[PDB]
Amino acid sequence: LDPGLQPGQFSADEAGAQLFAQSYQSSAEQVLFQSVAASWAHDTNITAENARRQEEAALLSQEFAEAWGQKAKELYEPIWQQFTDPQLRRIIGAVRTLGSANLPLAKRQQYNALLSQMSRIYSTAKVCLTATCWSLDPDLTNILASSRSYAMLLFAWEGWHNAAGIPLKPLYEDFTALSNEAYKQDGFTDTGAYWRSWYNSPTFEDDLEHLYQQLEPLYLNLHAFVRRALHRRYGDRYINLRGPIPAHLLGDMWAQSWENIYDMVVPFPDKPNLDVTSTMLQQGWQATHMFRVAEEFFTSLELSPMPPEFWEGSMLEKPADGREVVCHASAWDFYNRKDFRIKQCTRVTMDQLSTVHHEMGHIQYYLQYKDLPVSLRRGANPGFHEAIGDVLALSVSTPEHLHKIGLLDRVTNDTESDINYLLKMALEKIAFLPFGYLVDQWRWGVFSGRTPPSRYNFDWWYLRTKYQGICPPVTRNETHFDAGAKFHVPNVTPYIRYFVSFVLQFQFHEALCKEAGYEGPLHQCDIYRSTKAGAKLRKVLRAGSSRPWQEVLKDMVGLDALDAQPLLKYFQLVTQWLQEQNQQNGEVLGWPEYQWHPPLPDNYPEG
Ligand SMILES: *[C@@H]1O[C@H](CO[C@@H]2O[C@@H](C)[C@@H](O)[C@@H](O)[C@@H]2O)[C@@H](O[C@@H]2O[C@H](CO)[C@@H](O[C@@H]3O[C@H](CO)[C@@H](O)[C@H](O)[C@@H]3O)[C@H](O)[C@H]2NC(C)=O)[C@H](O)[C@H]1NC(C)=O
Ligand SMILES: *[C@@H]1O[C@H](CO)[C@@H](O[C@@H]2O[C@H](CO)[C@@H](O)[C@H](O)[C@H]2NC(C)=O)[C@H](O)[C@H]1NC(C)=O
Ligand SMILES: CC(=O)N[C@@H](CO)C(=O)N[C@@H](CC(=O)O)C(=O)O
Ligand SMILES: *[C@@H]1O[C@H](CO)[C@@H](O)[C@H](O)[C@H]1NC(C)=O
Ligand SMILES: [Cl-]
Ligand SMILES: [Zn+2]
């Protein structure tokens, strides 16, 4: 480690700690910068040489983290918890958690190489037919979204899961052991316990379970209604009205979001078409229009525009030179208070427009907290960070707002039109809930050792069936590693944040709508141009992780806890409607034929 980046000496007290944090701050930015830059260079241009550079950068970060971590632990270990400055406690607490920096050098290099190889496998995996091969984004994504051929969807689903999952498995095992070894030296029973500690809630798991209990009936009814719509198209052979839905038929590789099957499920097709994808295509929208439209929502609230550095640096389309990139949309803070970027292989669709807002919400958080200490540049919790862009996207999605931006010619205000809208939103928001909940249940079980490698797939499918009521459309065994075919698993990005975000965003929505002085139905609120709503949201953003999330939430929404009531309020009309419809159709709620799998198509997989 560079002499300039090394910690000096400070007194064994709070006044020393302060100078410690400020000295940390000065060097941490450069170290964070070089790490993020190397990661950027790799993720926008996947090469062996860029991987080597990124690992080298990661080693430097671990060296830095070890030095300042051991210094923090040398001077402040039995005393930091009693510090009077709560922000300083949070800075110190972060600095003294070494993570992977606890590993000896050889194991550090192993760990860094595993992360690099897992990332490369996921993002360069292909499905091949001919010499021609399909990438996940955009090829397989488009098939899952718009093909209605059972056999073709199966080819894409199986192809992807086989291609990404199978080679990831041995690496993922090794990563798990090393991660646990690292965090066990920070005092956590396993990595999952460390991840859960970010919510600073001794009752976190029970609180999530209580939330899910309230949400589950909404999902069960949506599921039964959707299954019926699928049965009408795919027939009795491929859809079991009392069994799980085959996992490839829901519009999405992970069946995580069901908005792409909206045309099959739309209750009243004679009302205005609420999926504006075809209109965006008709009008010739490109990625840059999408990002500018997103930005203009943020400025309408008197939040920050995207700086020149964002526009100059970002990767907003998949590169045309055909170079390998990480296509999964992400938002980047370079920690120099200047560079902030999105990397998205943007496609011209309504869901992608929502995704643009999601990523821009991350950027806005970065812009607002850029002048806090580096350790405090994160959300009040990770679910807050995930919720910002989605909150705005809720307003953007409204038929009224779409009309304002020229994406919906007709405007209607009737019960049918409300049901269509709320159903479309349920496909996006309700359908996701089980998946957002289950991923880290799976991962926590793996970190804790409850799920050994011998049960990775058995336990993944247990949870997928239990929560989502889906089944794999082909037979799977333990050679398959279907959890690894989801981005966040090989890229080691925690998932419970998305479940938290999906509850939280409705709490935020309700509060900002109230602040905007909006008086109507919650699901028709558009906060666009509300400078009052903007100021309320800005208070959250500028706080970063400087204050307990429970207190930041209290200030914003009047409650110090996650609460399903705003989501329930928002969906109330369609919750009642689906329940009525299912009863009148004589549906079974759930999937009591839990063992059921669909047969293979006759000529699978030739032609
Ligand atoms: C779409 O339509 C709904 C429903 O509108 C109501 O019912 C219709 C069948 C007609 O009879 C309408 O004349 C009638 O307003 C609209 O929701 C409604 O918005 C109004 C005005 O913002 C709300 O009234 C307010 O109520 C609060 C107290 O809650 C008072 O403080 C205010 O002074 C104000 O009078 C009303 O609560 C609300 N109705 C329901 C059932 O939620 C909606 O605004 C409209 N949307 C669009 C996009 O046009
Ligand atoms: C993708 O990454 C490679 C490195 O792996 C880049 O190629 C290098 O570019 C530097 C600086 O422009 C040159 O000095 C080197 O000669 C190149 N090195 C190697 C090993 O080829 C490449 O430019 C990157 N591509 C894009 C489009 O950014
Ligand atoms: C696509 C994207 O980057 N956004 C994600 C986070 O990775 C997100 O908001 N949530 C879920 C579901 C989704 O609709 O994107 C995800 O795993 O992608
Ligand atoms: C799992 O399934 C594949 C193909 O369906 C098969 O080739 C393989 O033998 C099975 N793996 C094991 C370990 O039995
Ligand atoms: Cl998280
Ligand atoms: Zn995100």
Author numbering: 1 to 129, 133 to 610
Task: Please give sentences taken from the publication describing this entry.
Angiotensin-1-converting enzyme (ACE, EC 3.4.15.1) is a zinc peptidase and a key enzyme in cardio-vascular physiology. Interestingly, ACE consists of two catalytically active domains (referred to as the N- and C-domains based on location on the polypeptide chain) that, while very similar in sequence and structural topology, display differences in substrate processing abilities. N-acetyl-Ser-Asp-Lys-Pro (Ac-SDKP) is specifically cleared by ACE10.
Co-crystallisation experiments were carried out to assess the interaction between the N-domain and tetrapeptide Ac-SDKP. Surprisingly, two crystal forms were obtained. The structure at 1.8 Å showed electron difference density within the catalytic channel, which was interpreted as the Ac-SD product, resulting from the enzymatic reaction. The two different fragments occupy a similar position within the S1′-S2′ sub-pockets while only interacting with the zinc ion through water-mediated interactions. The acidic group of the substrate Asp showed signs of flexibility, but may make further water-mediated contacts with the backbone of surrounding enzyme residues Glu431, Thr358 and the Ser260 hydroxyl group. The AcS amino group interacts with a single water molecule itself connected to Thr358 (main chain) and Asp393.
